[PDB]
Design a protein around this ligand. Structure first.
Ligand SMILES: N[C@H](C(=O)O)[C@@H]1CC[C@@H]1C(=O)O
Ligand SMILES: N[C@H](C(=O)O)[C@@H]1CC[C@@H]1C(=O)O
Ligand SMILES: [Cl-]
Ligand SMILES: [Cl-]
Ligand SMILES: [Cl-]
Ligand SMILES: [Cl-]
Ligand SMILES: [K+]
Ligand SMILES: [K+]
Ligand SMILES: [K+]
Ligand SMILES: [K+]
Lengths: 255, 255
């Protein structure tokens, strides 16, 4: 009741990153970003402490065809962490196994690609194969496509699940692929927004395919979830999260 | 901590219905259905009691353009009820203001219409005006269309929000309209499944437009939400909810 909460997370700019330093860092001090700021603010408000640990398999979390979970979702299921502090998408399938705080950020799935394509929608992607496309493996975006019954997205998932190379390990690998190949990444929109201010030859293709939130993950029936939710709620009324988003998204202009 | 919880709900076959009787009924005894069975099972498991009350405005809940809520969602926000026990759709927009148990049922938005139309998808509906279409006013389905950035659904919401008659007060009014007019109802799929076993000239058009869950609503930071969630979780592992669904959905065959 006073012990430090175990926080599971993974590296994802600009939510969670290794901060820069000449010396070798350790413990919580290794980390910085939007999600680290949020965590600090919550811990201040609620008077708790924590130890940050990186999820070993580097995954957000998905269920294989035998109902077995992995990634951060699994860490929460097994109660190996008290919180998942990351851009962890709140979804219907995940809510069957774990709980989430109220949403701290709104986003939707869209498309990341190089500038200068006739392609202007998911429809255009789905009806060709010249431009390859995919998504991060074992996260919310993959799961969305795998479960969709909308024809366009059904065809896209038919393609994705057929190409072994098409699913990337993480956003970073995906972004690198869009820069070095004829490849479009299905990516969440807040990240696209951050990436396209920095890599000036990349852009969002089309609009948002859905609308959903990020939440702090907890094991189902966690005693910390509600107070975190209330803490988040108050930060939001004074627009603290908006400000915090600006701090980590602001910067690099484009020609 | 031992008082009876206030349960808000509304009439919606076959989740919540007035049971049949020669005499005049009162209190909890007035009600029966899938959601009443679920509630009873939960109250048995967790040892709580309750008073069922019908939400006055007969709405599930939506936010007007000034951020003001209504329906059962409002009842929970104002803490006038401890639980919303109904087919209350868990959504991202609602999770900003209230909390939900883990999902007790999976559903998606689809289309209800009379048999024998060339129309076989939302795409076909959206590209004509002969067949009118709409949804229950101030619920999850309406909100989905109002917030969608998918072109087809954007056009549909353009139509819906232009016709004053197009949004119905509730599913029942909507179903009656499909029987008496050239009108298709955007409706949740579990209800379509129940309706089409009974009204043999009605049918689902197309597939599921999304995938989401029903949840028992609570005020944000309710102390009862977690135990209800765990109770639901255990019922699910022994397939009690599947059985309960069969009990209320089973019956009337079709030629
Ligand atoms: N927010 C997502 C999740 O919770 O799974 C992550 C971002 C990469 C991955 C994805 O896009 O699916
Ligand atoms: N489950 C929905 C809700 O929670 O708002 C109800 C069903 C009619 C209405 C709707 O379809 O939008
Ligand atoms: Cl670590
Ligand atoms: Cl904010
Ligand atoms: Cl009443
Ligand atoms: Cl079940
Ligand atoms: K260093
Ligand atoms: K402490
Ligand atoms: K009676
Ligand atoms: K009691």
């Amino acid at each position: 009741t006073n012990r430090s909460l175990i926080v599971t997370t993974l590296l994802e700019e600009p939510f969670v990153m290794f901060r820069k330093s000449d010396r070798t860092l350790y413990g919580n001090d290794r980390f910085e970003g939007y999600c680290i700021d949020l965590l600090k603010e919550l811990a201040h408000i609620l008077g708790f402490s924590y130890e940050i640990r990186l999820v070993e398999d580097g995954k957000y979390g998905a269920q294989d065809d035998k109902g077995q979970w992995n990634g951060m979702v699994k860490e929460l299921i097994d109660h190996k962490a008290d919180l998942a502090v990351a851009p962890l998408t709140i979804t219907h399938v995940r809510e069957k196994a774990i709980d989430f705080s109220k949403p701290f950020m709104t986003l939707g799935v869209s498309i990341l690609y190089r500038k200068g394509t006739p392609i202007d929608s998911a429809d255009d992607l789905a009806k060709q194969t010249k431009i390859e496309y995919g998504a991060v493996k074992d996260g919310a975006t993959m799961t969305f496509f795998k479960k969709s019954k909308i024809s366009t997205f059904e065809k896209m998932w038919a393609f994705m699940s057929s190409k072994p190379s098409a699913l990337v390990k993480n956003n970073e690998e995906g972004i690198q692929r869009t820069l070095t190949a004829d490849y479009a990444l299905l990516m969440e929109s807040t990240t696209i927004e951050y990436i396209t201010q920095r890599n000036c030859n990349l852009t969002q293709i089309g609009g948002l395919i859905d609308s959903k939130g990020y939440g702090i993950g907890t094991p189902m029936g966690s005693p910390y979830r509600d107070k975190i939710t209330i803490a988040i709620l108050q930060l939001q009324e004074e627009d603290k999260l908006h400000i915090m988003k600006e701090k980590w998204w602001r910067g690099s202009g484009c020609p």
